[PDB]
Paper text:
pmcα1-Antitrypsin is the most abundant circulating protease inhibitor in humans. The most common severe deficiency allele, and the most actively researched, is the Z variant (rs28929474; Glu342Lys). This mutation induces the formation of ordered polymers that accumulate as inclusions within the endoplasmic reticulum of hepatocytes and circulate as functionally inactive molecules. We have previously generated monoclonal antibodies (mAb) that recognize different epitopes within the α1-antitrypsin polymer, including the 9C5mAb.
This was partially ameliorated by using antibody-derived Fab domains. The crystal structures of 9C5Fab alone and in complex with RCL-cleaved α1-antitrypsin (referred to here as AAT:9C5Fab) were solved; the latter localized the epitope to helices D and E of α1-antitrypsin. Fab binding at this peripheral epitope would double the effective molecular weight of the monomer subunits from ~50 kDa to ~100 kDa, confer additional visual features and possibly improve the rigidity of the polymers to assist with the subsequent computational alignment of images. To facilitate particle detection and determination of orientational and translational parameters, monoclonal antibody Fab domains with known epitopes were used.
Author numbering:
A (entry chain L): 1 to 214
B (entry chain H): 1 to 52, 52A, 53 to 82, 82A, 82B, 82C, 83 to 99, 101 to 215
Write the structure that this text describes.
């Protein structure tokens, strides 16, 4: 039961800086410490063999050091392809324990979202439901708010939001907001509005459509 | 030459049993220790146990004593993880790894979902822009995949032709059904002049749906 405590959980860093991930073994572990990298949707990949020995085909910017209780994983110059979750591991005592993980996030300049609004599909209207979908693409920082307005009235029920993981190409986030209503309620009203309030602008980014038009 | 081939995804009712296969290549299984790791969604990695294929020695984390039984067959170079008494807490991706002389190689992972909810094929709805939508250099098209269970579904655009401007959003669970959306941004000179089709696959229900993005007709 040698437990590995890994800090930080979230590492907000800028490209070109240096990230240091620390894993503290509750008891002595010495040589038997490994560091893993897990890109989203991929199996974890080993980066450090025995707390300082890079496996092979590993960028020399990935370094590890420490002995006993204190162990450190350091990225010399953070890069876009380094976006992943990093785990420490102890194989000294057979109750093998991983760290909680460190999610690395790249810092970049504020980017305004590109907002698109889509009326419910014709096929779904036959089903008896109506989903209005709003896309907020290529924005930073991640925190953003979406307000749904129907004929000028704010709607807070039936809204599902989903954020993408940070895109390594441009270090941005994308979010999708879906307002789901009954077909009768959708056909009752005409104006449906998607509003995006972000750190880029005090004013909200607004996209709308009218149902009595098609 | 060293790869670990894992079995396909499994959906099981609570209380059932599952067996996962990890077929190896490029290294005999008895000269290394095979390990199995559990990862719950949006969570960390949990070491289940290790199997010594030469003699059958098994060591488990005390939380996986009865739930997980590790068996190995050196003849097929295949390691097995059997999961019984399955509950919702066992819903996770299960990996198999080979460890020898502080060396590691991992398989692709196998997803096991434990739920009483029935398998539900998705409904795929094309999302064309509004009839009076703004015209610009680029046009964004959408695709809605609603009311399916279990995860995962795969979304492609024009069978992989369109890939640069695709944002597929993580699914959201609601009333035991998942819903996700996918967006593709293409130059306005290429739509509707060229075809844009949403390709959705839901392996658990053996569903493959292609939905072309047709401009809205009034």
């Amino acid at each position: 039961s040698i437990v590995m405590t890994q800090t930080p959980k979230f590492l907000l860093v800028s490209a070109g800086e240096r990230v240091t991930i620390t894993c503290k073994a509750s008891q002595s572990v010495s040589n038997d410490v490994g560091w893993y990298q897990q890109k989203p949707g991929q199996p974890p990949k080993l980066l450090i063999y025995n707390a300082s020995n890079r496996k092979n085909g590993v960028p020399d910017r990935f370094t590890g050091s420490g002995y006993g209780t204190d162990f450190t994983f350091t990225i010399s110059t953070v890069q876009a392809e380094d976006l992943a979750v990093y785990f420490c591991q102890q194989d000294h005592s057979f109750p093998l324990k991983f760290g909680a993980g460190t999610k690395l996030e790249l810092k970049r300049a504020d980017a305004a979202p590109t907002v698109s609004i889509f009326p419910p599909s014709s096929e779904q209207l036959t089903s008896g439901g109506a989903s209005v979908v709003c896309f907020l693409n290529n924005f930073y920082p991640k925190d953003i708010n979406v307000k749904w307005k129907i004929d000028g009235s704010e709607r807070q029920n039936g809204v599902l939001n989903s954020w993408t993981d940070q895109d390594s190409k441009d270090s941005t986030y994308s979010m999708s907001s879906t307002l789901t209503l009954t077909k009768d309620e959708y056909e009752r009203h005409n104006s449906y509005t998607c509003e995006a309030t972000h750190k880029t602008s005090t004013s909200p980014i607004v996209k709308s459509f009218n149902r009595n038009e098609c | 030459q060293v790869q670990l081939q894992q079995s396909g995804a499994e959906l099981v009712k609570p209380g059932a049993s599952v067996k996962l296969s990890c077929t190896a290549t490029g290294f005999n299984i008895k000269d290394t220790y095979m390990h199995w790791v559990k990862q719950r969604p949006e969570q960390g990695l949990e070491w289940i146990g290790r199997i010594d294929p030469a003699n059958g020695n098994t060591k488990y984390d005390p939380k996986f004593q009865g739930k997980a039984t590790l068996t190995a067959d050196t003849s097929s170079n295949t390691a097995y993880l059997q999961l019984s008494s399955l509950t919702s807490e066992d819903t996770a991706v299960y990996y198999c790894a080979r460890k020898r002389y502080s060396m590691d190689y991992w398989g692709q992972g196998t997803s096991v979902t434990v739920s009483s909810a029935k398998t539900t094929p998705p409904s795929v709805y094309p999302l064309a822009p509004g009839s009076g939508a703004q015209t610009n250099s680029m046009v964004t098209l959408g695709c809605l995949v609603k009311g399916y269970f279990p995860e995962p579904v795969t979304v492609t655009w024009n069978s992989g032709s369109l890939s640069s401007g695709v944002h597929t959003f993580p699914a959201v669970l609601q009333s035991d059904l998942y819903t996700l959306s996918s967006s593709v941004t293409v130059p306005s000179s290429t739509w509707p002049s060229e075809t844009v089709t949403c390709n959705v696959a839901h392996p658990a229900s053996s569903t493959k749906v292609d939905k072309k993005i047709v401009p809205r007709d009034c």
